[PDB]
Structures are given as structure tokens and as C-alpha cells.
Symmetry: D2
């Protein structure tokens, strides 16, 4: 990944580590816009489909007229590190930001940014 | 409404008015935390249940360690004004912020802050 | 409560008592069509918003070309009895079957059918 | 494609073709259980995440104590044929029926049954 993309990991990690330990708010996400800005968010757990952290980030970016997002990552609390977006997120990301990459762990546990279509054939 | 509650309407209105007209991003929301901070967000439309503006606000508040939220409102694009929270939002709000009020239009069309339970009556 | 409405309770109760005890599948629902038919369903728990039992009923009715539904009820496992529809279900029910009633417990814990609009005052509309 | 896989396509197709054309109810799904039954369903469109046809099938199978589902397909109205499950369905399917296959179109447009994990690659 680029150093710009590497900053997303730092930002999402700082976000989740900065809030009280919660079962409702347990994952942070950060995304990079095509114009260089970073947007963050935290998940909202609910059985009716409370948004994943990634979806909160999408709404936060949209609130800032961010336009295209080029990369996204999610980081779990309790030092869990990078978590791949769930299938719901993969679908919303493909549909609203088809040019986006997601940061996931490679075969060696190392961060890599992959095109959303690779995660949702 | 209280002065603070009125400010939520202004903030959410400014937020939705500021972004490109979109079918995907068409409602803004603003919520007040107990400490007086305001958090905003815009909906993300998706058939799988992309979050309402209110839920984006909840995640934005949580990201800032806002704690308990006391009031929330949603404002539609294209001068639609106050929109009540939908049923899913009411459930999430009740479960995560039971002390919260939502701003809705009363029977005379005037803004009123209503306890979340009163929006999910028995 | 009408005889037909009461049958919804019996049916949903039968359904939840006819499946293994599960944390994924823990509530049953039944609805009545204007054509007299009854449609059932159970919930599918998932954090991304797996459907409530009521929503599974809606898709089951739709698969049978049921048309308009007039009443719905949900019955919980662990002998919980009648469970009011959640906010999400209230919205979907109002939007897709605006004339529907939901069976809920009254003050004395007894079954009563109320109009969906009564369960969502000051509705989201534009 | 095996006999039972072709049969699921036929059952889902008959289901969607048998109901009035609707923007709310526009996709049917069918799934096979290991105990020798087939369950159908149609989608319920709603912005809060009304269930996909596949999720209606999952609740219909659950209502019948079906246990393990081994194959699923979705068929669109107006002669659209096979539709791949969306990302949310893939996630729910993986989590609740990890042994399931979904019928999708291959590169030639022909039906193929693929393990659910293949549809959510790393
Ligand atoms: C009954 N509960 C739920 C407790 C759950 N054990 C929390 C959980 O699993 N949360 C996960 C859901 C969203 C979430 N998530 C999942 C997928 C994705 O793409 N993005 C996310 O933010 O990660 C969370 C996590 O792993 O901690 C509460 N009291 N809140
Ligand atoms: C993307 N689309 C779908 C267009 C939909 N007709 C938009 C809509 O109704 N959106 C509503 C969903 C969320 C949303 N909302 C709804 C309820 C609620 O509690 N909060 C919200 O943010 O308001 C939106 C609105 O009214 O504009 C297309 N390209 N055709
Ligand atoms: C970690 N988990 C989740 C366990 C939950 N404690 C189950 C639950 O609360 N389920 C509720 C969600 C849907 C659901 N429901 C809720 C509202 C509504 O309107 N209809 C429903 O079917 O009722 C269920 C119930 O009360 O048993 C799993 N292993 N599955
Ligand atoms: C204006 N509208 C919405 C109309 C939409 N154009 C219908 C749609 O796209 N529906 C899709 C959603 C579910 C759905 N679906 C999608 C994915 C999946 O895995 N299973 C599904 O059943 O397929 C449907 C379809 O393709 O027709 C209403 N008031 N109803
Ligand atoms: Zn997700
Ligand atoms: Zn809502
Ligand atoms: Zn519900
Ligand atoms: Zn789906």
C-alpha cells in the first residue's frame, strides 16, 4: 500500500483506541478521498442492521461533499488490527464507490489494498 | 424548542444544503450531546439498509466519545424541512440513547422535541 | 380479538414450538391475508440486519401473491408470548401494508389488535 | 449443473413468474435442504434493508426446522434469469449455512454452483 493508504490504518487505530470500550461501538474505519482528505467513523451495533464503521465513514465523507473514496480500512478494538469489510459493506462500497480499494491482511498478515471487486466477484 | 434544539435544525439544514443534490445522499441529521457538542451526518442510501442520516450521526458521535445524546433532527434536501426519524431509527435510538428526544413537526406544523419512547408507543 | 386474529397467535405459537431452540431463529410470526390465507415465518438473526420474523412473513405472503395483509403477530421462544413489532418492522409494515393491524399486549397483558399507524406516530413522510 | 440445481432454478423461476409484476417483490429464491425439502421466498424491498429473496428463504427454511441448506439460487422477474446473491446475502449465507453453494452465471453466462466462500474471497 501507499504511504497515503498507510495513514488510514494509523487514523482508524487512533479513533477506536480513543473511545470507551463498548460492545455497541467496537470498530473504527477511515477512508481516503480522491482529493486527499481522510474521514473516520465508528460502527453502531444493532440487530436491525446498525451501520458498520465503513458505512458511517461513507456518510461522513458524503456530509463533507468528499466525492470519490479511493481506499478504506477498518480496525477493531482491543488491538485486533485490520478487519476485512463484511459482505454488506463490500456491496455498498462496490455500488457507491466502484473505484475503491479496501485494506485487508495478506497471506502473511501484512496490510494490502485490494480492489473492491476482488472481494466481491 | 430550546435554543440548542433550534441550532440542530440550522446545522442539519446547512449540512444538506451544502452538498451536491444526490439520490444517494439526500437527508442530513444533527444531534446534541450532553456536553453541548453537535454531530452531523448524511444518509447513505442502499437497498440492504444503508444507514439513515440519524445512524451516521450516531456513529459520528460515538467516534468522538460523545456519550449520551439528548436531541436529534433530520432535514431533507430540496427544502423539504424536518423529517421524522423512520421506524428503524426510532428502534436504534431507543436502544442506544433511551434518554434522547427527536424533533418532529407537531399537529400544527411547528417543531417539537419528543421523547423517543413516545415515537414507539405501545 | 376476532377469531381469525386469534388463529394468527395459535399458528405463530405452533411454529416457534416446532423448531429447535436457537439464538439465530428465536421468534415466529404469522399474518392474515384479505384472501383468508395465513403466512408464517421466523426471524434470521444477523448484525447486518437479518430479517425479523415479520419481514420473513411479508416475503412469504408475497411469494404466494397474497396481496394485502390485514393483521400480523409475533410470538417469541422461551414461552415469551406476544412481542410487539420493532421500529424497523413498523416502518416496513406501514410502507407495504398501510391498512395492517399488529397484535400486541394491552395494559393487562391481553392480546389486542392495533392499527399500524398507531404504532408509528408523527411518521417519516415526504 | 446437477438435477437438484436445475430444479431449484425451475422452482425459483416459477415462483417469481407466478406473482404480479411489482417493484417491491421482484426476485424469487429457492434453496434445497439436506433433509429433502425445497424452500422458496421473494424479496421485500425497503430502504431500511427489507430482506432479499435469499433471506426470506432462510427464514422460511428456519420456520420448517430445515437445518442445513446445501444450495440456493435467485431469479429476477421479467425473464432476467439467475442473479448472484448480493454481498449482504453472501455474508448471512456464510455465517448461517457455511456449507451452502449458490448458483451463479459463469463467464459464458451458464449456471454454475459455487461454494459460498468463493463468493467472499479474502
Ligand atoms: C449484543 N451486542 C452485540 C455484541 C457483538 N459481539 C458486537 C459485534 O460483534 N460487533 C461487530 C459488528 C460490526 C462490526 N463490523 C463488522 C463488519 C464490518 O464490515 N464492519 C464493522 O464495523 O464489527 C463489530 C466487531 O467486530 O466488534 C451488543 N450489546 N452491542
Ligand atoms: C438512490 N436511489 C433511491 C432514491 C430514493 N427514492 C431516495 C430516498 O427515498 N431516500 C430516503 C432514505 C433515507 C432517508 N432517511 C429516511 C428516514 C430516516 O429516518 N432517515 C433518513 O436519512 O431519507 C431519504 C430521503 O427522504 O431522501 C436511486 N438512485 N433511485
Ligand atoms: C449473538 N446472537 C444473537 C442472540 C440474540 N440475543 C438473539 C435476539 O435477541 N434475537 C431477536 C432479534 C429479532 C427478533 N425480532 C425482533 C423484533 C421484531 O420486530 N421481530 C423479531 O423477529 O427477536 C429476537 C428475539 O427476541 O429473540 C446469535 N448467536 N444469534
Ligand atoms: C422504487 N422502489 C425500488 C425499486 C427497485 N428498483 C427494485 C430493486 O432494485 N429491487 C432489487 C432488490 C432486491 C433484490 N435482491 C437483490 C440482491 C439479492 O441478493 N437478492 C435480492 O432479492 O433484487 C431486486 C431486483 O433486482 O429487482 C420501490 N418502491 N420498491
Ligand atoms: Zn460491514
Ligand atoms: Zn431512519
Ligand atoms: Zn422487527
Ligand atoms: Zn441480497
Amino acid at each position: 500500500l501507499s504511504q497515503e493508504e498507510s495513514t488510514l490504518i494509523e487514523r482508524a487505530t487512533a479513533t477506536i483506541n480513543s473511545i470507551p470500550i463498548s460492545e455497541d461501538y467496537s470498530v473504527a474505519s477511515a477512508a481516503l478521498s480522491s482529493d486527499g482528505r481522510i474521514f473516520t467513523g465508528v460502527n453502531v451495533y444493532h440487530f436491525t442492521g446498525g451501520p458498520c464503521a465503513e458505512l458511517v465513514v461513507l456518510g461522513t465523507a458524503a456530509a463533507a461533499a468528499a466525492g470519490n473514496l479511493t481506499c478504506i480500512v477498518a480496525i477493531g478494538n482491543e488491538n485486533r488490527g485490520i478487519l476485512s469489510p463484511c459482505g454488506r459493506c463490500r456491496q455498498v462500497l462496490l455500488d457507491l464507490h466502484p473505484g475503491i480499494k479496501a485494506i485487508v491482511k495478506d497471506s502473511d498478515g501484512q496490510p494490502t489494498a485490494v480492489g473492491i471487486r476482488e472481494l466481491l466477484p
